[PDB]
Design a binder for these strands. Structure first.
Ligand code: SF4
Ligand code: ZN
Ligand code: ZN
Ligand code: ZN
Lengths: 380, 677
DNA sequence: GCGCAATCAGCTGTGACTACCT
DNA sequence: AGGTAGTCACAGCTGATTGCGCT
């Protein structure tokens, strides 16, 4: 039999009348049924995270000249890579991104492994007008990535992302030995192809524990990159992982005070353009070096400079807010004014916190569980 | 699980059954209830054997009296071993689902070389000497002299089997060839002799085609085993062709030289009955007379014996007594080894055949050889012309002979090529969650010029350039290996030479490696190995071969090997050698078969056979392209198997190279996504 | 000479414009 | 003093003819 070949559903049978006018009250419940459409979780997935040293490998062969994605594969790939870098640094405070470009059977480290978001975007924009020549070499790029990531601490999750456009690769040596070495080194390799499935990429992804995907269109490309944005799950307690990092205060300089010392930024000194001679910026807590961007690891003393609000933004996942007990208004014997918004309690249900025993309306309960993430009563 | 057919319940190892398998089982049950022959056609190499074995076992359980013996003749040894292990898996499933054993015996039969335990005969690679050495080691005279316990090197497995293995039977336990060898070596018995003693008390047994199509051994291996028996020839799309090889022999200078060398030794041994001793001496001169005669062709199958009886004045009757001489006179001579004696046996068989079988045969003499046309090479061929002669003995001895393979698209030509009364006319097309193949026919190129491999355009520069461009820009869209087939070795080498002359082969070189298949077995094997290893990694490669080659059917391109199979023109067999034309005339004046229709049938059969090996398994997928406008014609599309017709839409029947490349890109991109079960 | 595909004849659908009787 | 069968345009379909291709 079939589900639709039985009896026809009469959804209008729900409403009922007993006093020739009670229908309004029923729709009121519908309004109360309208709210609370969320699970009280903006993400609802991974409640923790782990540091990642991700490497993005970009093909630079003639296949990037194909016009499958307007205008060509290289331009759309670099645009989506800039978006991916921005989102990845937004959702990962202490992660690092390196960029390798494979071209003419060789691999060139376009950008060193670091946590600066602006540097990677500028490098990609510069590389937009590169010349596509030769054929890619997965062996060289993987060897460089493994060599750089070999010395990274074990607690960090070492990940390599390969954007493989061309369907052929030139291997100066056997690649399966390299795959076994990567497996022994615990390196996660994921490949997002553009043309069609390749056996070597599938084998590499399967053996190294990564995921291999093939692009259907630009939207699917963006979806795959967004899926790669999310950090991998981490164990409850793995090792002794701790890192010495400073917290530079953003001290600006004013001529009203006598402590206004202009200084060139250390990061801006390394650029080809004239370094910014600004009034002030971020001062390193260890060597008092001046920087304009965060989070940027200090070039002099090697300390990492991280903004405290970025780290603190994810603390609500560590201490989720417990759901308030839904209590009907009639069964509650107390004040009928909401503790949060001071509004009169007229809804059929009143929510009471389990700790401070304060009363919150539907709107205040939703606001606390969704955005505030902390009970105002428990704060006091 | 338990499939409930209209009057039976059949256990199947796999819980999930495809609709094609269920329909195939229904049709086979209908045929078995019809008590008649038939022909079947399935698109999957795997899944057919398990279903066939399950239905055979179910029919035997339901009707033990109706069916007693089952035969599953295949093409080679890998098929035999894989069907044996499939039967083993089926029996294990039945045991685990039922709990009690059954008295069913299953054994695999092969040559004496495959099944032997003596370490003094295994290392050698002489298939014509293993039988002779085996007969010399053990025979009637060996058994007679074993009473006195003669101290001579001889096989002793039979000397123990005849007193110990002929009493204990094997009611239960299906044994593979290696299992049979292990049992023989642990019990001190010959695997071949115990197999011969056990076929009578057995349920199922498998072997190759040569044990049924060749009358010299089929009668010995199957004379009164079962009047009501079932036999199947799986993967026999070219069965008629091998039927020709059942009754085709060739004679050359080496054969007659060997005969004249060994007849002196035979005469010397004799002088150490007379009806044949003097009879054999003057037989060689009649056939060597044609050696000194420089004539193009002589055709007289009935009048050849007339010429024999005019030149030497011999009656036709004693020739019919030559065959029975082999088992009578030779055993008296005590031949040490059959080496340097096979040409005499084949000449005797040829004489017996021409004395007996001459109604639908033809004698041909060819003074032509490869690269040495007319120096010294009169080749005599007693070429067969009717496939019914090789198929009548199995049709008159069995009830439900079934012919099935992966390519039997015209079901109306096989019943008239050979005497047959089909009652099935059944075709099956596999279905999955997605279209696993994208066949397409590419006609004119970017220059709007047809790329047909016509004989008048084989040397045309335009078609060669179009083929090169197609292979080049196609190699950049389909990864990890492309298998391309050409019409012939000569055309293939001329085309690759032309590509080398131009600056086009280098462009293909940087995309994929180029590998060429030649006649050398070792070279072909090493080329296949390096192609496989190159396709394993991301380098990718192109395997160029011929449709009518030993590599066409010797290997299967499993998934990720040969994602694309390219057909460069319709592969037409050469009309020379005056061998094809004789068969065409015989079919015209006997079976009323159109010559053009038969040529098209053969070409499309070979093309489909060499193109359908890219899809092995449900998860496997592949691309199939035909680089000839002639394929677009309806009379040739209709010759493709039904499981490829519905996937060949009318949209892409004459599309150019660029649109074909776009279609291939779209198909691969949409097939790279994950699927479900 | 035969066989497959291109071509036309005849009929019909859809929508709108036009010349004689209540 | 106010309304419908022919007629025209542009498509569809099927039922034959009717020149074009040949290892
Ligand atoms: S009798 Fe058997 S074991 Fe002995 S030589 Fe012959 S095949 Fe081998
Ligand atoms: Zn510092
Ligand atoms: Zn409130
Ligand atoms: Zn609280």
């Amino acid at each position: 039999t079939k589900r639709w070949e039985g009896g026809y559903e009469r959804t209008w049978e729900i409403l009922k009348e007993d006093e020739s006018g009670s229908l309004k009250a029923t729709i009121e419940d519908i309004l109360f049924k309208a709210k609370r459409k969320r699970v009280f979780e903006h993400h609802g997935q991974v409640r923790l995270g782990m540091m990642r040293h991700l490497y993005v490998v970009v093909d630079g062969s003639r296949t990037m000249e194909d016009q499958d994605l307007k205008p060509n594969r290289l331009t759309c790939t670099l645009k989506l890579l800039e978006y991916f870098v921005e989102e990845y640094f937004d959702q990962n405070p202490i992660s690092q991104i390196g960029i390798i470009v494979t071209k003419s059977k060789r691999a060139e480290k376009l950008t060193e492994l670091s946590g600066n978001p602006r540097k990677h975007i500028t490098s990609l924009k510069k590389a937009v007008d590169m010349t596509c020549h030769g054929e890619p070499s997965l062996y060289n790029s993987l060897s460089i990535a493994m060599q750089t990531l070999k010395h990274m601490p074990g607690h960090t999750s070492r990940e390599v992302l390969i954007i493989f456009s061309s369907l052929t690769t030139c291997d100066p040596s056997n690649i399966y030995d390299l795959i076994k070495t990567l497996k022994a080194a615990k390196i996660r390799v994921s490949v997002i192809g553009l043309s069609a499935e390749v056996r070597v990429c599938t084998v590499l992804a399967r053996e190294t524990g990564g995921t291999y995907h093939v692009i259907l269109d630009e939207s699917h490309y963006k979806e795959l990159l967004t899926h790669h944005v999310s950090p991998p799950p981490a164990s409850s307690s793995s090792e002794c992982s701790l890192i010495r990092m400073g917290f530079p205060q953003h001290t600006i300089a004013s001529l009203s005070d006598q402590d206004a010392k202009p200084s060139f930024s250390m990061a801006h000194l390394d650029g080809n353009t004239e370094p910014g001679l600004t009034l002030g910026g971020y001062f390193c807590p260890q060597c008092r070096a001046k920087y304009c961007e965060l989070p940027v690891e200090c070039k002099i003393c090697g300390l990492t400079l991280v903004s405290a609000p970025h780290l603190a933004r994810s603390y609500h996942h560590l201490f989720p807010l417990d759901a308030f007990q839904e209590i009907p208004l009639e069964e509650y014997n107390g004040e009928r004014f909401c503790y949060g918004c001071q509004g009169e309690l007229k809804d059929q249900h009143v929510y009471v916190c389990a700790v401070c025993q304060n009363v919150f309306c539907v709107d205040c309960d939703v606001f606390v569980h969704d955005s505030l993430h902390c009970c105002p009563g428990c704060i006091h | 699980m338990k499939l409930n057919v209209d009057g039976l319940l059949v256990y199947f190892p796999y819980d999930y059954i495809y609709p094609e398998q269920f329909s195939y089982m229904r049709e086979l049950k209908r045929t078995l209830d019809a008590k008649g022959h038939g022909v079947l056609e399935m698109p999957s190499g795997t899944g057919k054997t398990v279903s066939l074995l399950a239905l055979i076992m179910a029919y035997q359980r339901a009707y033990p009296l109706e069916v007693t013996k089952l035969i599953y003749c295949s093409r080679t040894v890998p098929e035999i071993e894989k069907v044996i292990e499939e039967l083993r898996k089926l029996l294990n499933f039945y045991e685990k689902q039922e709990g009690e054993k059954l008295p069913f015996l299953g054994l695999a039969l092969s040559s004496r070389k495959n099944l032997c335990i003596h370490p003094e005969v295994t290392p050698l690679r002489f298939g014509k000497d293993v039988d002779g050495k085996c007969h010399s080691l053990t025979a009637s005279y060996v058994r007679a002299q074993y009473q006195h316990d003669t101290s001579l090197p001889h096989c002793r497995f039979y000397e123990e089997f005849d007193a110990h293995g002929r009493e204990v039977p094997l009611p239960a336990g299906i044994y593979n060839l290696d299992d049979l060898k292990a049992l023989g070596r642990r019990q001190g018995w010959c695997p071949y002799f115990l197999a011969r003693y056990s076929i009578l008390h057995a349920n199922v047994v498998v072997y190759s085609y040569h044990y049924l199509l060749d009358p010299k051994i089929a009668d010995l291996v199957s004379k009164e085993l079962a009047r009501k028996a079932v036999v199947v020839f799986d993967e026999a799309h070219n069965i008629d062709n091998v039927c020709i090889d059942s009754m085709s022999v060739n004679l050359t200078r080496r054969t007659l030289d060997r005969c004249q060398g060994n007849l002196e030794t035979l005469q010397k041994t004799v002088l150490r009955a007379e009806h044949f001793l003097g009879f054999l001496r003057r037989l060689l001169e009649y056939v060597k007379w044609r050696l000194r005669v420089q004539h193009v062709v002589q055709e007289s199958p009935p009048a050849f014996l007339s010429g024999l009886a005019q030149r030497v004045c011999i009656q036709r009757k004693p020739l019919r007594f030559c065959a029975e001489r082999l088992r009578s006179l030779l055993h008296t001579l005590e031949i040490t080894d059959l080496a340097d004696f096979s040409p005499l046996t084949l000449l005797a068989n040829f004489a017996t055949l021409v004395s007996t079988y001459a109604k639908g045969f033809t004698i041909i003499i060819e003074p032509f050889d490869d690269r040495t046309p007319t120096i010294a090479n009169p080749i005599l061929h007693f070429s067969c012309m009717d496939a019914s002669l090789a198929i009548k003995p199995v049709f008159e001895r069995f009830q439900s002979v079934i012919i099935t393979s992966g390519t039997l698209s015209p079901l109306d030509i096989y019943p008239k090529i050979l005497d047959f009364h089909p009652v099935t006319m059944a075709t099956f097309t596999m279905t999955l969650a997605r279209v696993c193949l994208c066949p397409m026919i590419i006609g004119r190129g970017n220059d709007q010029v047809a790329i047909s491999s016509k004989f008048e355009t084989r040397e045309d520069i335009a078609v060669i350039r179009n083929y090169g461009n197609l292979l080049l820009e196609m190699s950049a869209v389909v990864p990890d290996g492309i298998v391309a087939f050409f019409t012939s070795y000569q055309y293939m080498e001329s085309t690759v030479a032309s590509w080398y002359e131009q600056g086009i082969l280098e462009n293909i070189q940087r995309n994929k490696l180029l590998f060429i298949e030649t006649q050398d077995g070792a070279e072909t094997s090493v080329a296949l190995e390096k192609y496989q290893e190159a396709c394993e990694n991301g380098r990718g490669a192109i395997l160029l071969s011929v449709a009518r080659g030993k590599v066409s059917e010797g290997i299967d391109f499993v998934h990720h090997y040969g994602r694309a199979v390219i057909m460069f023109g319709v592969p037409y067999v050469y009309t020379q050698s005056r061998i094809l034309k004789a068969r065409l005339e015989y079919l015209r004046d006997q079976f009323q078969i159109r010559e053009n229709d038969f040529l098209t049938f053969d070409a499309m059969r070979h093309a489909a056979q060499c193109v359908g090996r890219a899809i092995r398994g449900k998860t496997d997928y592949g691309l199939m392209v035909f680089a000839d406008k002639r394929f677009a014609r309806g009379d040739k599309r209709g010759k493709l198997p039904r499981w490829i017709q519905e996937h060949l839409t009318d949209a892409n029947l004459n599309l150019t190279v660029d649109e074909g490349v776009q279609v291939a890109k779209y198909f691969l991109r949409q097939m790279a996504q994950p699927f479900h079960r």
